[PDB]
Amino acid sequence: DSLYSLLVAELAGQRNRFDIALSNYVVQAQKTRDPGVSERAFRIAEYLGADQEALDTSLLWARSAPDNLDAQRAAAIQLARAGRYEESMVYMEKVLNGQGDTHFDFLALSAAETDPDTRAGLLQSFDHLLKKYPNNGQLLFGKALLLQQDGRPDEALTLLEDNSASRHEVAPLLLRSRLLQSMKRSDEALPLLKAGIKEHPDDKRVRLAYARLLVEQNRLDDAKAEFAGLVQQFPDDDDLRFSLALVCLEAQAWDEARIYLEELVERDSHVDAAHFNLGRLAEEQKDTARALDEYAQVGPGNDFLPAQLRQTDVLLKAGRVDEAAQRLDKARSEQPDYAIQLYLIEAEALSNNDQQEKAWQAIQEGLKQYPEDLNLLYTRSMLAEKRNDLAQMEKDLRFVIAREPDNAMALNALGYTLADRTTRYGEARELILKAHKLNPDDPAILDSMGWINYRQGKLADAERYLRQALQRYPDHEVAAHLGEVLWAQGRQGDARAIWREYLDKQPDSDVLRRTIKRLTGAE
């Protein structure tokens, strides 16, 4: 281990902080200006000058002052921080490629190991803090979080077992319980949670975790009593009541969940989410009328689109597609802010219930209404590709990649279709390279990279890229691609063995079945 070897982790930390700063700037730019007090005073002043028809000339003069202009201060701070981070990153990439006595300069190695942004430095700082203040509950909780996220949960649990504060403090106890539940030994977590209520009776999260652990076992009857006790001690907590309704709804005890949801309706808190969950429960109860009447009264927000999708799905289950289209059009006319998302809902529902022609017609209608929506024509591309229509699929995909030269996924999609179907191999290499440079973390882009490398002739690079893409996430398509690429280079047993796992007797593995027949056909 040397200093140059340690600098990469520092660069990774700088990358994380740069990403966070840039995303922070992005969310700042969209956000409206905070009320503050100057705009509040101007609001009361406008409320005053509104009484007389004569213009409040002094109010207009003051409200248009040069100091009343939004300079976007925090956004500029975030941008400048991201810029200096990028500058330092560039500097230390320039320092990395240099050669020298990287070793035996122990002064800088200590600073490289004390960096809180590196995982090893995080752990070193946590160890130094536990040395300074031992048995600190929050420090143990943070170190256990670090160890569990690092991919070593059992070591974190063993660290928790050695500390006595893990039995007393609420957050370490909660983390130890959810860790023990993942080790398939949930019963060991039962007594500790009880002891927590002995130490923290008024703490609602501890009792909620106790109730969830009761639900985990078959002994759910006491969990209903725990719900009743929580409601008895804190009948005003609306978020706690919503969480109790959610856990009761997970344990398919529909009666108490419906009771809690109607109680939330009476208290006028989380009304749209409450009605959405009532609609889901009624859909489970096969009560189509109640589910529809509850989905219709879901207000706009983070639950309007799921309610619309569930309504469309129930309508398609009933077979009255005309009423489904009419309700979706009426909802589009009611709230046109994300009407494009309503069209996406319609397309998804029609594609998931075997109405290919109606899905294509709805997408055509949506594009006629919004010809510039970049999601709508991409959905048209996927529908045309499912319809074996490569022409429309190429036209709109070229359209979207020309209008947005920096749309990775669409840029990726066409490229993959270039490698898999046609023989325009030169464009596909550049297309997949650009998609990989835009977002290397995307595993479908890595799959496309292995596929174009395999069809281009480079067998080793294709195998490595497909191996990486398969390591990130298990997919049947990537599995078949890796199997075929490995089979072509040789090592038949390895390709045969890789196929054994991801077959899994899956109806989704219908495409995978054809890869085996194509290659075992030569036998």
Q: How was this structure determined?
A: X-ray
Q: With contact defined as beta carbons under 8 Å apart, do 243 and 257 qualify?
A: no
How far separated are the first and last CA of the chain, in Å rounded?
51
Instruction: Kindly state whether residue 208 falls inside one of the protein's structural domains.
Output: no
Which string of b and e fits 349-359 if b means at least 16 CB within 10 Å? bbbebebeebb
* CB-based contact 74:28 (threshold 8 Å): yes
* Nearest partner of 130 among 96, 93, 162, 108, judged by Cα: 162
Q: Is 301 left (phi over 0), alpha (psi -120 to 50) or beta?
A: left
**CATH number of the domain encompassing residue 441:** 1.25.40.10
Residue of 233, 175, 161, 162 whose CA lies nearest to 204: 233
Q: At what angle do helices 189-199 and 204-216 cross, to 10 degrees?
A: 160
- 323 is a domain residue: yes
Residue 239 carries which side chain, given as an amino acid letter?
A: D
Q: What is the Cα–Cα distance from 234 to 236, expressed in whole angstroms? A: 6
**Do both 430 and 466 map to the same domain?**
yes
At what angle are helices 288-296 and 271-284 packed, to 10 degrees? Answer: 160
CA gap 105, 3 in Å, rounded: 8
Domain that holds residue 22: 3-63+71-98
Phi first, then psi: give them for residue 23, nearest 5 degrees.
-65, -35
Secondary structure (DSSP) of 456-517: HT-HHHHHHHHHHHHHHS--HHHHHHHHHHHHHHS-HHHHHHHHHHHHTT-GGGHHHHHHHH
Residues 501, 459: one domain? Answer: yes
- Which residues does 87 contact at the CB level (< 8 Å), separation at least 6? none
Same domain, 75 and 51: yes
Measure CA 439 to chain center. Answer: 16
In a domain, 167, yes or no: no
- The answer to whether 227 and 240 have CB atoms below 8 angstroms apart is no
Q: Is residue 12 part of a domain?
A: yes
Distance CA 466, CA 218 (A): 43
Cβ–Cβ under 8 Å, residues 385 and 418: no
- Residue 522 — φ and ψ, nearest 5°? -85, 65
- 490 — alpha (psi -120 to 50), left (phi > 0) or beta? left
Are 380 and 295 contained in the same domain?
yes
For the record, the structure tokens of 186 come out as 């949930």
Cα separation, 456 vs 462, whole angstroms: 9
Decide if 125 is inside a domain: no
Same domain assignment for residues 333 and 413: no
Give the domain-ending residue among 404, 424, 453. 404
C-alpha–C-alpha distance, residues 501 and 262, integer Å: 47
By the 8 A CB rule, do 86 and 18 touch?
Answer: yes
Residue after which a domain boundary falls, among 348, 378, 404:
404
**Is 399 in the same domain as 414?**
no
- Give the residue among 404, 335, 344 at the shortest CA–CA distance from 370: 344
Resolution in A, one decimal?
3.5
Q: What residues contact 1, with CB distance under 8 A and at least 6 apart?
A: none
* Total domains in the fold of the chain: 3
Same domain, 416 and 518: yes
Per DSSP, helices labelled H in 105-202 are 106-113, 119-132, 137-149, 153-162, 165-168, 170-182, 189-199
